Amino acid sequence: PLVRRLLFLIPPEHAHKLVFAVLRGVAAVAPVRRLLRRLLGPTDPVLASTVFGVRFPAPLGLAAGFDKDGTALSSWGAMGFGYAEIGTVTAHPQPGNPAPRLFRLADDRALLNFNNHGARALAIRLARHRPEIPIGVNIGKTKKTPAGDAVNDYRASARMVGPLASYLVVNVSSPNTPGLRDLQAVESLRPILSAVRAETSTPVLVKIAPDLSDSDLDDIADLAVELDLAGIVATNTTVSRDGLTTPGVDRLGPGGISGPPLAQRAVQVLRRLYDRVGDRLALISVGGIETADDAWERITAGASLLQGYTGFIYGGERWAKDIHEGIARRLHDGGFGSLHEAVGSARRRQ
Ligand SMILES: Cc1cc2nc3c(=O)[nH]c(=O)nc-3n(C[C@H](O)[C@H](O)[C@H](O)COP(=O)(O)O)c2cc1C
C-alpha cells in the first residue's frame, strides 16, 4: 500500500501514465514476463471455458480504457487476466476530452472520467504480436463525424481491426462523447450493428450503458438476438452521482463514475438480460467488480465473462489472481467441473 500512498498524491492521469510506461517495459523482457508468470502462473484448469466461439483460459479480463492504443498487449498475460480488450478506438484518430479528464473518489473507491490513435496504430501492433491470451477490440464513433456519417465510421473501423481481433465490442454507452448514448436507440443501432456484422466474421458485441430504462434494455436485447450478435457488455460508466462517499463531487463536473457504486446496477442489468436473452447470446458483466464473492454473484447470474477497470488501480498485482483462485475454490466447493456449468446457477435454481 506504500506505493499507492506514494502514487495516489500525484494526479491520477499522470500516475496512470507512469504505471503504463512501467508495464510496457516489462513486456520488453520476455523472461521477466515469463518470470512474473513463473511467480503466479498455475491457473486452475477448470476456470477455462469457451464463449461465443472463442475460448478463454480465465473469466476475468481488463476493461477498455487502460490501453486504448494497444501498446502493452504482451504485458497483460503476466498480470494474469484471462482475456484482454483494447480500449475504445475510432477509425480516425481523435484527441480525447481536454484536462482534467480523470478524478479520484477515494472513499467509495470510485473514479470519474475517447482519446485514441485510430485503427491504424492498433492494426500495426496486431500485425506483429503473438497473442498469449485472446484480445478484444472495442470500436467507437469518432467525435467529429456527424450522426448520419456515424454508421460509416463504425463500419470503416470494423474492417480494419476485425480480422486481427478475437471479438468486437460496439461502444454506444460511454457518456464522455456528445450524442453517443442516443445511438443506443434501437432504430439507429440496427444500421450500425448490421453493417459491422457483415464486414467481418469475428463475433461482434455491443456495450450498453447502466443509466438506461429497463424497457429500453429489453428492446436492445431483442435487437441483438435478431442480429445474432455474440454478446452484450454490461455496463459502461454511469452518469448518476448518487451514493458517493468522497467529498466535493459536485464541482468535478461531467463524467461517468465507475466502481463499487455502479455494481448494484450492473448486477440488476445482468439479472434482467440473462433471463431474456441468456441462451441466445453470451453476457459479459463489467463495472464494479473488486472481490471474489462479488465476481461469484456475477458468474452465478449468467456472466460468461467478467472485465473490470477500477479494481486494478486499488487492488494491485495479486488482485487478478486472487479472483481466479477465489472462483476456482467456489467451483470445487460447488462440485462443478468447468466454468460454463456454474454460469447461471443462481438463476436456474429459481
Ligand atoms: C477512468 C476510466 C475510463 C474508462 N474509459 C473508457 C472508455 O473510454 N471506453 C470504454 O469503452 N471503456 C472505458 N472504461 C471501462 C468501463 O468504465 C468499464 O467497462 C466499466 O464501466 C467500469 O469498470 P469498473 O467499475 O470495474 O472499473 C473506463 C474505465 C475507467 C475506470
Side-chain angles (χ1 to χ4, degrees), residues 138-189:
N138 179 359
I139 72 177
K141 176 203 72 68
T142 317
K143 176 170 183 191
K144 69 181 179 171
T145 60
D149 301 355
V151 175
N152 311 123
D153 181 354
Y154 270 113
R155 185 179 181 71
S157 78
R159 65 188 62 187
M160 286 157 181
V161 290
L164 311 99
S166 288
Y167 66 104
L168 291 195
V169 170
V170 189
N171 189 351
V172 279
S173 49
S174 208
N176 312 126
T177 299
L180 177 76
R181 296 190 63 226
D182 307 8
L183 268 59
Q184 298 175 302
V186 155
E187 66 151 41
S188 166
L189 198 55

CSV table of all heavy atoms in Angstrom, one decimal, residues 138-189:
chain,number,residue,atom,x,y,z
A,138,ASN,N,-12.7,-2.8,-28.9
A,138,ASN,CA,-13.8,-2.0,-28.7
A,138,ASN,C,-13.8,-0.9,-29.7
A,138,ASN,O,-12.9,-0.1,-29.7
A,138,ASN,CB,-13.8,-1.5,-27.2
A,138,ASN,CG,-14.9,-0.6,-26.9
A,138,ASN,OD1,-15.8,-0.3,-27.7
A,138,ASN,ND2,-15.0,-0.1,-25.6
A,139,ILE,N,-14.9,-0.8,-30.5
A,139,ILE,CA,-15.0,0.2,-31.5
A,139,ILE,C,-15.9,1.3,-31.1
A,139,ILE,O,-16.9,1.1,-30.4
A,139,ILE,CB,-15.4,-0.5,-32.9
A,139,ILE,CG1,-16.9,-0.9,-32.8
A,139,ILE,CG2,-14.6,-1.7,-33.2
A,139,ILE,CD1,-17.5,-1.5,-34.1
A,140,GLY,N,-15.6,2.5,-31.6
A,140,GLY,CA,-16.4,3.7,-31.2
A,140,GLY,C,-16.5,4.7,-32.4
A,140,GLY,O,-15.7,4.6,-33.3
A,141,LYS,N,-17.5,5.6,-32.3
A,141,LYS,CA,-17.6,6.7,-33.3
A,141,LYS,C,-16.7,7.8,-33.0
A,141,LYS,O,-16.6,8.3,-31.8
A,141,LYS,CB,-19.1,7.2,-33.2
A,141,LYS,CG,-19.4,8.3,-34.2
A,141,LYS,CD,-20.6,9.1,-33.8
A,141,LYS,CE,-20.4,10.0,-32.5
A,141,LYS,NZ,-19.4,11.1,-32.8
A,142,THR,N,-16.0,8.3,-34.0
A,142,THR,CA,-15.2,9.5,-33.9
A,142,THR,C,-16.1,10.7,-33.6
A,142,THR,O,-17.2,10.8,-34.2
A,142,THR,CB,-14.4,9.8,-35.2
A,142,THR,OG1,-13.9,8.5,-35.7
A,142,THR,CG2,-13.3,10.8,-35.0
A,143,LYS,N,-15.7,11.5,-32.7
A,143,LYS,CA,-16.5,12.7,-32.2
A,143,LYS,C,-16.8,13.6,-33.4
A,143,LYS,O,-17.8,14.3,-33.4
A,143,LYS,CB,-15.7,13.4,-31.1
A,143,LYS,CG,-16.4,14.6,-30.6
A,143,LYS,CD,-15.7,15.2,-29.3
A,143,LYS,CE,-16.4,16.4,-28.8
A,143,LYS,NZ,-15.7,17.0,-27.7
A,144,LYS,N,-15.9,13.8,-34.3
A,144,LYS,CA,-16.0,14.7,-35.4
A,144,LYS,C,-17.1,14.4,-36.4
A,144,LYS,O,-17.8,15.2,-36.9
A,144,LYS,CB,-14.7,14.9,-36.1
A,144,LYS,CG,-14.3,13.7,-37.0
A,144,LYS,CD,-12.9,14.0,-37.7
A,144,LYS,CE,-12.5,12.8,-38.5
A,144,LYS,NZ,-11.3,13.1,-39.3
A,145,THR,N,-17.3,13.1,-36.6
A,145,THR,CA,-18.2,12.6,-37.6
A,145,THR,C,-19.7,12.9,-37.1
A,145,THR,O,-20.0,12.6,-36.0
A,145,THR,CB,-18.0,11.1,-38.0
A,145,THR,OG1,-18.2,10.4,-36.8
A,145,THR,CG2,-16.7,10.9,-38.6
A,146,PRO,N,-20.6,13.4,-37.9
A,146,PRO,CA,-22.0,13.6,-37.5
A,146,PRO,C,-22.7,12.2,-37.4
A,146,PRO,O,-22.1,11.2,-37.7
A,146,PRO,CB,-22.6,14.4,-38.7
A,146,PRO,CG,-21.4,15.1,-39.3
A,146,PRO,CD,-20.3,14.0,-39.2
A,147,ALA,N,-23.9,12.3,-36.9
A,147,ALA,CA,-24.7,11.1,-36.6
A,147,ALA,C,-25.0,10.3,-37.9
A,147,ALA,O,-25.0,9.1,-38.0
A,147,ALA,CB,-26.0,11.5,-35.9
A,148,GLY,N,-25.3,11.1,-39.0
A,148,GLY,CA,-25.5,10.5,-40.3
A,148,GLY,C,-24.3,9.7,-40.8
A,148,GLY,O,-24.5,8.6,-41.4
A,149,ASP,N,-23.1,10.3,-40.7
A,149,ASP,CA,-21.9,9.7,-41.1
A,149,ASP,C,-21.4,8.7,-40.1
A,149,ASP,O,-20.4,8.0,-40.4
A,149,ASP,CB,-20.9,10.8,-41.4
A,149,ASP,CG,-21.3,11.8,-42.4
A,149,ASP,OD1,-22.4,11.6,-43.0
A,149,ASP,OD2,-20.6,12.8,-42.6
A,150,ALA,N,-22.0,8.5,-38.9
A,150,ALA,CA,-21.5,7.7,-37.9
A,150,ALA,C,-21.5,6.2,-38.3
A,150,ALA,O,-20.6,5.5,-38.0
A,150,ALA,CB,-22.3,7.9,-36.6
A,151,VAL,N,-22.6,5.8,-39.0
A,151,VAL,CA,-22.7,4.4,-39.4
A,151,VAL,C,-21.6,3.9,-40.3
A,151,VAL,O,-21.2,2.8,-40.2
A,151,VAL,CB,-24.1,4.1,-40.1
A,151,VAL,CG1,-24.2,2.7,-40.6
A,151,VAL,CG2,-25.3,4.5,-39.1
A,152,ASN,N,-21.0,4.9,-41.1
A,152,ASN,CA,-19.9,4.6,-41.9
A,152,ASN,C,-18.6,4.5,-41.1
A,152,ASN,O,-17.7,3.7,-41.4
A,152,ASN,CB,-19.8,5.6,-43.0
A,152,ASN,CG,-21.1,5.9,-43.7
A,152,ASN,OD1,-21.6,7.0,-43.8
A,152,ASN,ND2,-21.7,4.8,-44.3
A,153,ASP,N,-18.5,5.3,-40.0
A,153,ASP,CA,-17.3,5.3,-39.2
A,153,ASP,C,-17.3,3.9,-38.5
A,153,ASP,O,-16.2,3.2,-38.5
A,153,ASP,CB,-17.4,6.4,-38.1
A,153,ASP,CG,-16.2,6.5,-37.2
A,153,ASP,OD1,-15.3,5.5,-37.2
A,153,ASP,OD2,-16.1,7.4,-36.4
A,154,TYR,N,-18.4,3.5,-37.8
A,154,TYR,CA,-18.4,2.2,-37.2
A,154,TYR,C,-18.1,1.1,-38.1
A,154,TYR,O,-17.5,0.1,-37.8
A,154,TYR,CB,-19.8,2.0,-36.5
A,154,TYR,CG,-19.9,2.5,-35.1
A,154,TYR,CD1,-20.7,3.6,-34.7
A,154,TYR,CD2,-19.1,1.9,-34.1
A,154,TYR,CE1,-20.7,4.0,-33.4
A,154,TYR,CE2,-19.2,2.3,-32.8
A,154,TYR,CZ,-20.0,3.4,-32.4
A,154,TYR,OH,-20.1,3.8,-31.1
A,155,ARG,N,-18.6,1.2,-39.4
A,155,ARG,CA,-18.3,0.2,-40.4
A,155,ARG,C,-16.9,0.2,-40.8
A,155,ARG,O,-16.2,-0.9,-40.9
A,155,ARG,CB,-19.2,0.4,-41.6
A,155,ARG,CG,-19.2,-0.7,-42.7
A,155,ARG,CD,-20.1,-0.4,-43.8
A,155,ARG,NE,-20.0,-1.5,-44.8
A,155,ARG,CZ,-20.5,-2.7,-44.7
A,155,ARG,NH1,-21.0,-3.1,-43.6
A,155,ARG,NH2,-20.4,-3.5,-45.7
A,156,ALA,N,-16.3,1.4,-41.1
A,156,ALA,CA,-15.0,1.5,-41.6
A,156,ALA,C,-13.9,1.0,-40.6
A,156,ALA,O,-13.0,0.4,-41.0
A,156,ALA,CB,-14.7,3.0,-42.0
A,157,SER,N,-14.1,1.3,-39.3
A,157,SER,CA,-13.3,0.8,-38.3
A,157,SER,C,-13.3,-0.8,-38.2
A,157,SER,O,-12.3,-1.4,-38.1
A,157,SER,CB,-13.6,1.4,-37.0
A,157,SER,OG,-14.7,0.8,-36.4
A,158,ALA,N,-14.5,-1.3,-38.4
A,158,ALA,CA,-14.7,-2.8,-38.2
A,158,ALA,C,-13.9,-3.6,-39.1
A,158,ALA,O,-13.4,-4.7,-38.8
A,158,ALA,CB,-16.2,-3.1,-38.3
A,159,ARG,N,-13.7,-3.1,-40.4
A,159,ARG,CA,-12.9,-3.9,-41.4
A,159,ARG,C,-11.4,-3.9,-41.0
A,159,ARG,O,-10.8,-4.9,-41.2
A,159,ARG,CB,-13.2,-3.4,-42.8
A,159,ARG,CG,-12.7,-1.9,-43.0
A,159,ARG,CD,-13.1,-1.5,-44.4
A,159,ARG,NE,-14.6,-1.4,-44.5
A,159,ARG,CZ,-15.2,-1.1,-45.6
A,159,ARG,NH1,-14.6,-0.9,-46.8
A,159,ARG,NH2,-16.5,-1.1,-45.6
A,160,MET,N,-11.0,-2.7,-40.5
A,160,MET,CA,-9.5,-2.6,-40.2
A,160,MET,C,-9.0,-3.6,-39.2
A,160,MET,O,-8.1,-4.3,-39.4
A,160,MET,CB,-9.2,-1.1,-39.8
A,160,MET,CG,-9.3,-0.1,-40.9
A,160,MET,SD,-9.6,1.6,-40.4
A,160,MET,CE,-9.7,2.4,-41.9
A,161,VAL,N,-9.7,-3.6,-38.0
A,161,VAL,CA,-9.3,-4.4,-36.9
A,161,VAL,C,-10.0,-5.7,-36.8
A,161,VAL,O,-9.6,-6.6,-36.0
A,161,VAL,CB,-9.5,-3.6,-35.6
A,161,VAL,CG1,-8.6,-2.4,-35.5
A,161,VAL,CG2,-11.0,-3.1,-35.4
A,162,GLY,N,-11.0,-5.9,-37.6
A,162,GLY,CA,-11.9,-7.1,-37.5
A,162,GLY,C,-11.1,-8.4,-37.6
A,162,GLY,O,-11.2,-9.3,-36.7
A,163,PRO,N,-10.4,-8.7,-38.7
A,163,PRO,CA,-9.7,-10.0,-38.9
A,163,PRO,C,-8.7,-10.3,-37.8
A,163,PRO,O,-8.5,-11.4,-37.4
A,163,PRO,CB,-9.0,-9.8,-40.2
A,163,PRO,CG,-9.0,-8.3,-40.5
A,163,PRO,CD,-10.2,-7.8,-39.8
A,164,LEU,N,-8.0,-9.2,-37.2
A,164,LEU,CA,-6.9,-9.4,-36.3
A,164,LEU,C,-7.4,-9.5,-34.8
A,164,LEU,O,-6.6,-9.5,-33.9
A,164,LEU,CB,-5.9,-8.3,-36.4
A,164,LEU,CG,-5.5,-8.0,-37.8
A,164,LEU,CD1,-6.2,-6.8,-38.4
A,164,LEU,CD2,-4.0,-7.7,-37.9
A,165,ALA,N,-8.8,-9.5,-34.6
A,165,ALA,CA,-9.4,-9.5,-33.3
A,165,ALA,C,-10.0,-10.8,-33.0
A,165,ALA,O,-10.3,-11.6,-33.9
A,165,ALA,CB,-10.4,-8.4,-33.2
A,166,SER,N,-10.2,-11.1,-31.7
A,166,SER,CA,-10.9,-12.3,-31.2
A,166,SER,C,-12.4,-11.9,-31.1
A,166,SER,O,-13.2,-12.8,-31.4
A,166,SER,CB,-10.4,-12.8,-29.9
A,166,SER,OG,-9.1,-13.4,-30.1
A,167,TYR,N,-12.7,-10.7,-30.8
A,167,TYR,CA,-14.1,-10.3,-30.7
A,167,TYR,C,-14.2,-8.8,-30.8
A,167,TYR,O,-13.2,-8.1,-30.5
A,167,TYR,CB,-14.8,-10.8,-29.5
A,167,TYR,CG,-14.3,-10.2,-28.1
A,167,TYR,CD1,-15.1,-9.2,-27.5
A,167,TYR,CD2,-13.2,-10.6,-27.6
A,167,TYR,CE1,-14.6,-8.7,-26.3
A,167,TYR,CE2,-12.7,-10.1,-26.4
A,167,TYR,CZ,-13.4,-9.2,-25.7
A,167,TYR,OH,-13.0,-8.7,-24.5
A,168,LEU,N,-15.3,-8.3,-31.3
A,168,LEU,CA,-15.6,-6.8,-31.5
A,168,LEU,C,-16.7,-6.4,-30.5
A,168,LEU,O,-17.7,-7.0,-30.4
A,168,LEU,CB,-16.0,-6.5,-32.9
A,168,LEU,CG,-14.9,-6.7,-34.0
A,168,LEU,CD1,-15.4,-6.0,-35.3
A,168,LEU,CD2,-13.5,-6.2,-33.6
A,169,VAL,N,-16.4,-5.2,-29.9
A,169,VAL,CA,-17.4,-4.6,-29.0
A,169,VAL,C,-17.7,-3.2,-29.6
A,169,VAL,O,-16.8,-2.5,-29.9
A,169,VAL,CB,-16.8,-4.5,-27.5
A,169,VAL,CG1,-17.7,-3.6,-26.7
A,169,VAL,CG2,-16.6,-5.8,-26.9
A,170,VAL,N,-19.0,-3.0,-29.7
A,170,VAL,CA,-19.5,-1.7,-30.2
A,170,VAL,C,-19.9,-0.8,-29.0
A,170,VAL,O,-20.7,-1.2,-28.2
A,170,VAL,CB,-20.7,-1.9,-31.1
A,170,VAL,CG1,-21.1,-0.6,-31.8
A,170,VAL,CG2,-20.4,-2.9,-32.2
A,171,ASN,N,-19.2,0.4,-28.9
A,171,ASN,CA,-19.4,1.2,-27.8
A,171,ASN,C,-20.3,2.4,-28.1
A,171,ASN,O,-20.0,3.3,-28.9
A,171,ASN,CB,-18.0,1.8,-27.3
A,171,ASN,CG,-18.1,2.6,-26.0
A,171,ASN,OD1,-19.2,2.8,-25.5
A,171,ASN,ND2,-16.9,2.9,-25.5
A,172,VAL,N,-21.6,2.3,-27.6
A,172,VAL,CA,-22.6,3.3,-27.8
A,172,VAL,C,-23.0,3.8,-26.4
A,172,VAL,O,-23.9,4.6,-26.3
A,172,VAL,CB,-23.8,2.8,-28.6
A,172,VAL,CG1,-23.5,2.9,-30.1
A,172,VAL,CG2,-24.2,1.4,-28.1
A,173,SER,N,-22.2,3.5,-25.4
A,173,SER,CA,-22.6,3.7,-24.0
A,173,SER,C,-21.9,4.8,-23.2
A,173,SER,O,-22.5,5.4,-22.4
A,173,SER,CB,-22.5,2.4,-23.2
A,173,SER,OG,-21.2,1.8,-23.4
A,174,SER,N,-20.6,5.0,-23.5
A,174,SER,CA,-19.7,5.9,-22.7
A,174,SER,C,-20.3,7.3,-22.8
A,174,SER,O,-20.4,7.8,-23.9
A,174,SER,CB,-18.3,5.8,-23.1
A,174,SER,OG,-17.4,6.0,-22.0
A,175,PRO,N,-20.5,8.0,-21.7
A,175,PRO,CA,-21.1,9.3,-21.8
A,175,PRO,C,-20.2,10.4,-22.3
A,175,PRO,O,-20.7,11.5,-22.7
A,175,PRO,CB,-21.5,9.6,-20.3
A,175,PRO,CG,-20.5,8.8,-19.5
A,175,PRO,CD,-20.2,7.6,-20.3
A,176,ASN,N,-18.9,10.2,-22.3
A,176,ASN,CA,-17.9,11.3,-22.5
A,176,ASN,C,-17.9,11.7,-23.9
A,176,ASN,O,-17.1,12.6,-24.3
A,176,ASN,CB,-16.5,10.9,-22.0
A,176,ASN,CG,-16.5,10.2,-20.7
A,176,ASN,OD1,-16.0,9.1,-20.5
A,176,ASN,ND2,-17.1,10.9,-19.7
A,177,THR,N,-18.7,11.2,-24.8
A,177,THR,CA,-18.8,11.7,-26.2
A,177,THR,C,-20.3,12.2,-26.4
A,177,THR,O,-21.2,11.5,-26.2
A,177,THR,CB,-18.4,10.7,-27.2
A,177,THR,OG1,-17.1,10.3,-27.0
A,177,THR,CG2,-18.6,11.2,-28.7
A,178,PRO,N,-20.5,13.5,-26.9
A,178,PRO,CA,-21.8,14.0,-27.0
A,178,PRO,C,-22.7,13.3,-28.1
A,178,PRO,O,-22.2,13.0,-29.2
A,178,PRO,CB,-21.6,15.5,-27.4
A,178,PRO,CG,-20.2,15.5,-28.1
A,178,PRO,CD,-19.4,14.4,-27.3
A,179,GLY,N,-23.9,12.9,-27.6
A,179,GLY,CA,-24.9,12.3,-28.5
A,179,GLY,C,-24.5,10.9,-29.0
A,179,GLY,O,-25.0,10.5,-30.0
A,180,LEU,N,-23.7,10.2,-28.2
A,180,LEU,CA,-23.4,8.8,-28.5
A,180,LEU,C,-24.4,7.9,-27.8
A,180,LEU,O,-24.8,6.9,-28.3
A,180,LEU,CB,-22.0,8.5,-28.0
A,180,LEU,CG,-21.6,7.0,-28.3
A,180,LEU,CD1,-21.3,6.8,-29.7
A,180,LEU,CD2,-20.3,6.7,-27.4
A,181,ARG,N,-24.8,8.2,-26.5
A,181,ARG,CA,-25.7,7.4,-25.8
A,181,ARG,C,-27.1,7.3,-26.5
A,181,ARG,O,-27.8,6.4,-26.3
A,181,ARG,CB,-25.8,7.9,-24.3
A,181,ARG,CG,-24.5,7.8,-23.5
A,181,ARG,CD,-24.7,8.1,-22.1
A,181,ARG,NE,-25.6,7.1,-21.4
A,181,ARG,CZ,-26.5,7.5,-20.6
A,181,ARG,NH1,-26.7,8.7,-20.1
A,181,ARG,NH2,-27.4,6.5,-20.1
A,182,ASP,N,-27.4,8.3,-27.3
A,182,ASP,CA,-28.6,8.4,-28.0
A,182,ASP,C,-28.6,7.3,-29.1
A,182,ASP,O,-29.7,6.9,-29.5
A,182,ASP,CB,-28.9,9.8,-28.6
A,182,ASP,CG,-28.8,10.9,-27.6
A,182,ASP,OD1,-28.4,10.6,-26.4
A,182,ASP,OD2,-29.1,12.0,-27.9
A,183,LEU,N,-27.5,7.0,-29.7
A,183,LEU,CA,-27.4,5.9,-30.7
A,183,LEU,C,-27.9,4.6,-30.2
A,183,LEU,O,-28.3,3.8,-31.0
A,183,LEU,CB,-25.9,5.8,-31.1
A,183,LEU,CG,-25.5,6.6,-32.3
A,183,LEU,CD1,-25.6,8.1,-32.0
A,183,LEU,CD2,-24.1,6.3,-32.7
A,184,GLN,N,-28.0,4.4,-28.9
A,184,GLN,CA,-28.4,3.1,-28.3
A,184,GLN,C,-29.9,2.8,-28.7
A,184,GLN,O,-30.3,1.7,-28.5
A,184,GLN,CB,-28.2,3.1,-26.8
A,184,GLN,CG,-26.7,3.3,-26.3
A,184,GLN,CD,-26.6,3.4,-24.8
A,184,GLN,OE1,-27.1,4.3,-24.2
A,184,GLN,NE2,-25.8,2.5,-24.3
A,185,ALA,N,-30.6,3.8,-29.1
A,185,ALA,CA,-32.0,3.6,-29.5
A,185,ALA,C,-32.0,2.6,-30.7
A,185,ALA,O,-31.1,2.6,-31.5
A,185,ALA,CB,-32.6,4.9,-30.0
A,186,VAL,N,-33.0,1.7,-30.7
A,186,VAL,CA,-32.9,0.5,-31.5
A,186,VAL,C,-32.8,0.9,-33.0
A,186,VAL,O,-32.0,0.3,-33.7
A,186,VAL,CB,-34.1,-0.4,-31.2
A,186,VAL,CG1,-34.5,-1.3,-32.4
A,186,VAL,CG2,-33.9,-1.2,-29.9
A,187,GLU,N,-33.7,1.8,-33.4
A,187,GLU,CA,-33.7,2.1,-34.9
A,187,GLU,C,-32.4,2.6,-35.4
A,187,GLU,O,-32.1,2.4,-36.5
A,187,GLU,CB,-34.9,3.1,-35.2
A,187,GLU,CG,-34.6,4.5,-34.6
A,187,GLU,CD,-35.3,5.5,-35.5
A,187,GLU,OE1,-36.4,5.3,-35.9
A,187,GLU,OE2,-34.6,6.6,-35.7
A,188,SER,N,-31.7,3.4,-34.6
A,188,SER,CA,-30.4,3.9,-35.0
A,188,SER,C,-29.3,2.8,-34.9
A,188,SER,O,-28.3,2.8,-35.6
A,188,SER,CB,-30.0,5.1,-34.3
A,188,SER,OG,-28.6,5.4,-34.4
A,189,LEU,N,-29.5,1.9,-33.9
A,189,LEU,CA,-28.4,0.9,-33.6
A,189,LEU,C,-28.4,-0.2,-34.7
A,189,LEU,O,-27.3,-0.7,-35.1
A,189,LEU,CB,-28.7,0.2,-32.3
A,189,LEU,CG,-27.5,-0.5,-31.6
A,189,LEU,CD1,-26.3,0.4,-31.6
A,189,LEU,CD2,-27.9,-1.0,-30.3
